[PDB]
Amino acid sequence: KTAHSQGIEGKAMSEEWARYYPRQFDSWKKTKESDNITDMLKEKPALVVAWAGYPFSKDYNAPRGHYYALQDNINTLRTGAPVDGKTGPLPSACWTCKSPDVPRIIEQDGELEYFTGKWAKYGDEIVNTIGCYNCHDDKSAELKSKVPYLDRGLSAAGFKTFAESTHQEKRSLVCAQCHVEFYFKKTEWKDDKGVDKTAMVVTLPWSKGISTEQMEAYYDEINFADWTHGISKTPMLKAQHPDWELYKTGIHGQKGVSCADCHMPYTQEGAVKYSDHKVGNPLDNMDKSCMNCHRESEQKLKDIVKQKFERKEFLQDIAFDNIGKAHLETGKAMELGATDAELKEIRTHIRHAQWRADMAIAGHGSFFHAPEEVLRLLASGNEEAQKARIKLVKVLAKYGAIDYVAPDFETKEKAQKLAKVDMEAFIAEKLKFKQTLEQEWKKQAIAKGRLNPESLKGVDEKSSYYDKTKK
Ligand code: HEM
Ligand code: HEM
Ligand code: HEM
Ligand code: HEM
Ligand code: HEM
Ligand SMILES: O=S([O-])[O-]
Ligand SMILES: [Ca+2]
Ligand SMILES: [Y+2]
Numbered sequence: 429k430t431a432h433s434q435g436i437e438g439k440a441m442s443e444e445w446a447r448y449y450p451r452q453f454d455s456w457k458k459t460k461e462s463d464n465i466t467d468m469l470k471e472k473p474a475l476v477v478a479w480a481g482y483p484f485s486k487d488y489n490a491p492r493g494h495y496y497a498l499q500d501n502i503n504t505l506r507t508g509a510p511v512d513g514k515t516g517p518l519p520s521a522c523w524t525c526k527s528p529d530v531p532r533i534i535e536q537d538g539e540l541e542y543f544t545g546k547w548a549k550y551g552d553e554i555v556n557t558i559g560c561y562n563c564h565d566d567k568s569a570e571l572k573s574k575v576p577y578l579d580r581g582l583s584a585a586g587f588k589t590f591a592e593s594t595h596q597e598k599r600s601l602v603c604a605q606c607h608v609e610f611y612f613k614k615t616e617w618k619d620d621k622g623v624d625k626t627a628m629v630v631t632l633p634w635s636k637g638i639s640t641e642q643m644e645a646y647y648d649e650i651n652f653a654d655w656t657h658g659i660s661k662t663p664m665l666k667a668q669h670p671d672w673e674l675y676k677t678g679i680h681g682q683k684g685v686s687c688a689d690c691h692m693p694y695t696q697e698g699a700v701k702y703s704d705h706k707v708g709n710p711l712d713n714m715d716k717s718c719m720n721c722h723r724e725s726e727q728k729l730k731d732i733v734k735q736k737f738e739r740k741e742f743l744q745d746i747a748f749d750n751i752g753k754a755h756l757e758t759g760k761a762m763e764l765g766a767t768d769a770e771l772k773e774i775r776t777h778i779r780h781a782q783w784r785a786d787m788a789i790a791g792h793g794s795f796f797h798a799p800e801e802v803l804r805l806l807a808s809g810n811e812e813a814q815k816a817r818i819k820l821v822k823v824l825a826k827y828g829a830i831d832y833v834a835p836d837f838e839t840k841e842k843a844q845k846l847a848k849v850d851m852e853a854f855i856a857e858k859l860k861f862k863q864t865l866e867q868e869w870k871k872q873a874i875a876k877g878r879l880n881p882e883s884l885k886g887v888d889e890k891s892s893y894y895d896k897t898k899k
């Protein structure tokens with residue numbers, strides 16, 4: 429039994445746990461060290477074309493430390509510039525995987541209420557970043573999943589629920605609360621006051637299983653689209669960081685190595701074992717993360733991982749080049765008068781191409797967690813894109829444009845022009861929001877005692893559109 433067996437007052441604030449667990453608190457805070465903003469649209473402008481019509485064509489950066497999760501959720505151009513709790517582009521579900529205030533609010537408002545309304549609804553309540561309470565019971569300190577959709581997905585896929593799982597399984601499932609592919613299911617409900625409401629509920633598309641193809645079948649069966657492509661008008665699916673799903677296809681996952689084994693390695697100090705809570709790049713800490721199971725040098729292992737990254741990059745660039753061209757060629761065919769009927773098969777190929785390729789690349793560790801599945805997925809996605817392009821030549825020819833050359837999209841700026849993203853306008857609007865409503869949110873949360881200003885140190889120095897140069 430713990431020193432906090434009746435629970436922790438202010439449990440959503442990780443600082444409240446520090447008195448009991450100073451070591452884990454200290455290492456947990458060190459994800460502040462991982463402050464790099466890598467603008468993935470700048471690095472891979474083909475993604476802008478892939479995501480035309482979708483917020484990821486505005487702003488999409490690589491992950492950084494958990495310390496920044498909440499602030500990055502606020503800063504991303506994807507969440508736009510609300511003026512109040514009823515405005516802004518995105519729904520309340522966007523907080524879900526960013527904050528320990530999420531289970532706090534779910535446990536208080538209920539899941540459906542939590543999932544009802546705009547992201548801006550909770551701006552002055554959801555103010556702590558990924559914290560102890562996202563993964564731990566505040567009485568027993570045991571690992572817990574705090575979000576109902578995970579068990580729902582696990583059960584749908586025929587897996588054991590969190591509670592039914594082994595400890596070693598839980599050491600990955602706590603991560604899978606967030607590091608999974610999801611969609612928002614529009615969910616009609618009626619509250620305690622009999623008011624009809626609409627929730628957008630985080631849902632794991634796992635009822636046919638957790639392979640990319642099973643999820644593709646799932647989404648096709650329900651005719652789901654995350655958006656209609658801004659160039660090709662294809663019904664598109666967006667993959668989001670299927671880190672756990674793909675990790676399950678990989679040899680380490682198959683062998684029962686948990687996320688925590690690599691990302692939260694143990695340090696043994698006499699009779700006491702401590703987990704490193706600085707969740708980051710295991711390659712920064714290889715003696716602890718890798719070398720308990722692997723012999724021979726760190727450099728050789730690093731070199732092998734680099735080769736995996738390079739193979740993935742090679743296939744990713746091919747697949748997304750063909751995907752981008754297919755979108756653009758479809759847009760051209762549309763401009764010339766090609767009908768939806770004439771483009772239907774093409775669009776299905778593009779949807780599947782991009783679903784598979786996005787699923788391969790959307791988990792930034794998948795190239796390592798499941799290298800062979802990632803390569804197969806990129807190859808499969810590229811094949812679908814090329815089938816679309818072969819069919820597109822014929823449609824273009826029918827409309828007198830067989831010699832059409834899809835425009836180049838080799839810089840973010842050129843790609844964003846093709847995707848009709850006025851990023852300057854979005855940035856200007858965003859800055860106004862940050863300078864006004866965001867600061868009101870933080871001021872109110874501090875006044876109410878939901879937010880400790882200590883947690884804000886260095887948290888808002890960088891985004892894809894500013895860098896105060898300090899983080
Ligand atoms: C032990 C389980 C977990 C592992 C192994 C893990 C792994 C990671 C890693 C390696 C990163 C990038 C870190 C860096 O660049 O330095 C990251 C970022 C992120 N993780 Fe986790 N994670 C876990 C649990 C969670 C949970 C439970 C959530 C949701 C509550 C979550 C949400 C996120 C988010 C939102 C980011 C991006 C933060 C940002 O860019 O601001 N993770 N995670
Ligand atoms: C559409 C609503 C959401 C928004 C606006 C949002 C925003 C963000 C942002 C800004 C990042 C940092 C990287 C980037 O710039 O893209 C991020 C990363 C991440 N988000 Fe979300 N998020 C949303 C929904 C979710 C949900 C529901 C989950 C969990 C089920 C989740 C889990 C994660 C994870 C695990 C990462 C780090 C891994 C990665 O970026 O590949 N996010 N999110
Ligand atoms: C500052 C906030 C946190 C505190 C005070 C805390 C506390 C603890 C404690 C006391 C332990 C057991 C001793 C140890 O292995 O070090 C532990 C382990 C662990 N925690 Fe945390 N934790 C925090 C944040 C998190 C978060 C956010 C996650 C999930 C993303 C997480 C996931 C885990 C995992 C996977 C283990 C290993 C469990 C095991 O191997 O038995 N912790 N943590
Ligand atoms: C489902 C469980 C796991 C989750 C949620 C997870 C999460 C992540 C994430 C989000 C990244 C990308 C980090 C970034 O882009 O900044 C990553 C990369 C990586 N992970 Fe994992 N991981 C898991 C399992 C594992 C395991 C079991 C190992 C060791 C065998 C491992 C080792 C690595 C390595 C070597 C990288 C590449 C370096 C990096 O980008 O940080 N991961 N992981
Ligand atoms: C980030 C640290 C690690 C790195 C860089 C790493 C690297 C690798 C590589 C390159 C492979 C070949 C499989 C493939 O083609 O992807 C592999 C396999 C394997 N690794 Fe790791 N690994 C790490 C962590 C771990 C840990 C923590 C464990 C044990 C808890 C482990 C146990 C295994 C096992 C059992 C295999 C299957 C081959 C065999 O049976 O020996 N690895 N690892
Ligand atoms: O936007 S979140 O799912 O990466
Ligand atoms: Ca999705
Ligand atoms: Y306290």
Ligand SMILES: [Y+2]
Pocket residue numbers: 462490491492493
């Ligand atoms: Y990173």
Ligand SMILES: [Y+2]
Pocket residue numbers: 799800
């Ligand atoms: Y392999």
